[PDB]
């Protein structure tokens, strides 16, 4: 029960949702673009970006507005579902060629 | 080569300390 | 105003004439063309000083 | 068509490139408008445009026939101007200009990218609202 890994800024975030930012500890460059592009890859999702805020602080800041459709902690839900699901692609492709070879 | 060296092996180094 | 044929009124008009609109027989054309060129709203003078 | 501000079409006189690699900035004069210039600047890696190509240029507000306050696209299936059109800019007409007797020249913004529309009788049309599609086709 990790309660410490990813936080809500409320200061960022709107009435009903739609619109927030999430603050992710632990976290960079790496994970911040792929999450982007895959919530991108969304249709309800009308902005997405990240920012590391300061090199010093191993911080990472996503943003997601959506339009009415879903919320901002949806959008994030499902990024992080298809992430895992291309990543499970890319290995099941990966071992089967390296079983081929 | 042509091994799938994870799927034999059970990782532990992978896992966050 | 005067070039698009309707009255230049830069000085207060004195005559019987002056409390209907000076410009009821312009065809709202040049009336338009001159709102569209010309615009200026007593906010914007007031906002201004 | 009740929403088309001004549509005609023009024989581009001069493309131009200067010191760009995408945007070039083309002249025309209305074919059967003998008063209609036209200086735009377009694209051309999304739209190519050669000297002397007639093209058909079209000012609308709404393409069309919750307090989001983002901007929306249209959704695929939906029926609306620039269906017909190869090219399509949305931005601002910020200046009206007097250049003689009944001559006047109107300035869109689109995003950076001018238009510079020369004419005689565009004024219970063109305003200076926000509201100003831009659609050129071949």
Request: with cysteine.
């Amino acid at each position: 029960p990790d309660r410490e890994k990813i936080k809500l800024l409320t200061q960022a975030t709107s009435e009903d949702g739609t619109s927030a930012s999430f603050q992710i500890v632990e976290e960079d460059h790496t994970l911040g673009n792929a999450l982007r592009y895959v919530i991108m890859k969304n249709p309800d999702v009308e902005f997405c970006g990240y920012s590391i805020p300061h090199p010093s602080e191993n911080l990472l800041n996503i943003r997601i507005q959506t339009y009415g459709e879903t919320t901002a902690v949806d959008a994030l839900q499902k990024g992080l579902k298809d992430l895992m699901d291309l990543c499970d692609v890319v290995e099941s492709k990966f071992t089967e060629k390296i079983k081929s070879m | 080569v042509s091994r799938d060296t994870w799927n034999t092996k059970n990782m532990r180094s992978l896992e966050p300390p | 105003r005067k070039s698009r044929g309707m009255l230049g009124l830069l000085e207060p008009p004195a005559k019987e004439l002056q409390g209907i609109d000076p410009d009821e027989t312009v065809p709202d054309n040049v009336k338009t063309s001159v709102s569209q060129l010309y615009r200026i709203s007593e906010k914007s003078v007031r906002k201004f000083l | 068509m009740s929403n088309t501000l001004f549509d005609d079409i023009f024989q581009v006189s001069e493309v131009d490139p200067g010191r760009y690699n995408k945007v070039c900035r083309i002249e025309a004069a209305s074919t059967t408008q003998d008063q209609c210039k036209l200086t735009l600047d377009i694209n051309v890696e999304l739209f190519p445009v050669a000297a002397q190509d007639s093209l058909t240029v079209t000012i609308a507000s709404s393409l069309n026939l919750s307090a989001t306050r983002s901007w929306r696209p249209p959704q695929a299936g939906d029926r609306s101007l620039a269906d017909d059109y190869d090219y399509v800019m949305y931005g601002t007409a910020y200046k009206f200009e007097e250049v003689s007797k009944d001559l006047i020249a109107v300035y869109y913004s689109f995003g950076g990218l001018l238009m510079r529309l020369e004419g005689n009788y565009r004024n219970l049309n063109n305003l200076k609202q926000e509201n100003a599609y831009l659609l050129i086709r071949r």
